[PDB]
Structure formats: structure tokens, C-alpha cells
Design a protein around this ligand. Structure first.
Ligand SMILES: CNc1nc2ccc(C3=C(C(=O)O)CCC3)cc2s1
Length: 165
């Protein structure tokens, strides 16, 4: 039941909103988590989504890692969305503050194409160190399915919308 989004391109929408509140209110088929390779949900969007599941996401993630090993940078896995969504697509963008290649941000967003509709944050923003406006450009250039982007910070949201319109 997505509402209040501004359409940027044929398939990319954006809203100034807390992704945790959007997920609770909409219960989308897929919510994207901005994960790391070991699925340790310590801060940023990952910590927020995990806290909203009261750590059910972390317990399930630890079991995925013990059985399957870590993800690769640019890779993803599908796990339960618990109370936030039917599924959580955990996607690893490059941490350019740690020398990880920015080219891998395109590979990360390619994972979204397996799902027709997703609620997502911008990848590699925050502690991962990428420029969020560059991250939105890669999203627009790479994602072919319908993506509803939620951005918490009003100053960042206004900057993104100005660079697009
Ligand atoms: C409890 N809800 C939330 N906690 C956070 C923490 C960080 C963020 C981030 C960004 C943002 O959209 O402003 C970009 C970098 C990290 C978002 C949420 S929503």
C-alpha cells in the first residue's frame, strides 16, 4: 500500500520516510537490507531493520552464515522479512572507506532485478562511504524493476530530488 512517493523515472520512486515505518505500514513483498558480508546488523539501516524485528533477523542471519558462509561484495541472499515484509533481500554494497571497488555498486543493485517490486534504502550510503547522489544514479541506470526508495534524512532527500529534477 505504498503512498506518498515521487516518481523519478519509469520504475524508480522516492519518499522522505523512515524505511522501518514504511515496512511496518505497507508490509511489502520484499524489503532490502543494506547488509555486510557476515550479515552482522550493527548500525545504519541494517541495525534499524534488525531492532524492529527485536533481533529475530540477527538470529536467522547467524544460522544462514553458519550453514552457507559469508556473502561476496555485490552479492545477496533472500531470508524472512519477519514483521516487516514477506521477504528480506540482504544486499552487500562496497564499503569504499575500506578500499572496496565502487564498480561493485552496479553489481549490488543488479540483485534487485530478481523481484518485481521492492522497498529499499540507497546502497553504500552512510558508513559504507559512497556519495548518496552517485548511489541513486547507479540505481536508476541499473535497476529495471519497480523500486520504492525511502530516505530518512530530510536534507539528503531534498538534495537527491534537486539533482534529479
Ligand atoms: C530507525 N530508522 C532508521 N534508522 C536509520 C539509520 C540510518 C539511515 C541512513 C540513511 C537515510 O536514509 O537517511 C542514509 C545513511 C544511513 C536510515 C535510517 S531509518
Amino acid at each position: 500500500s505504498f503512498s506518498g512517493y515521487l516518481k523519478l523515472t519509469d520504475n524508480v520512486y522516492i519518499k522522505n520516510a523512515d524505511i522501518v515505518e514504511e515496512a511496518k505500514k505497507v508490509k511489502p513483498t520484499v524489503v532490502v537490507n543494506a547488509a555486510n558480508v557476515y550479515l552482522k546488523h550493527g548500525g545504519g539501516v541494517a541495525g534499524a531493520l534488525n531492532k524492529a524485528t527485536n533481533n529475530a533477523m540477527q538470529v536467522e542471519s547467524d544460522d544462514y552464515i553458519a550453514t552457507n558462509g559469508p556473502l561476496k561484495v555485490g552479492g545477496s541472499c533472500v531470508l524472512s522479512g519477519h514483521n516487516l515484509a514477506k521477504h528480506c533481500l540482504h544486499v552487500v554494497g562496497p564499503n569504499v572507506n575500506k578500499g572496496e571497488d565502487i564498480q561493485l555498486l552496479k553489481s549490488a543493485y543488479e540483485n534487485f532485478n530478481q523481484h518485481e517490486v521492492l522497498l529499499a534504502p540507497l546502497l553504500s550510503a552512510g558508513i559504507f562511504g559512497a556519495d548518496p547522489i552517485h548511489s541513486l544514479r547507479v540505481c536508476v541506470d541499473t535497476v529495471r524493476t519497480n523500486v520504492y526508495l525511502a530516505v530518512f534524512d530530510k536534507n539528503l532527500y531534498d538534495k537527491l530530488v534537486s539533482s534529479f529534477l
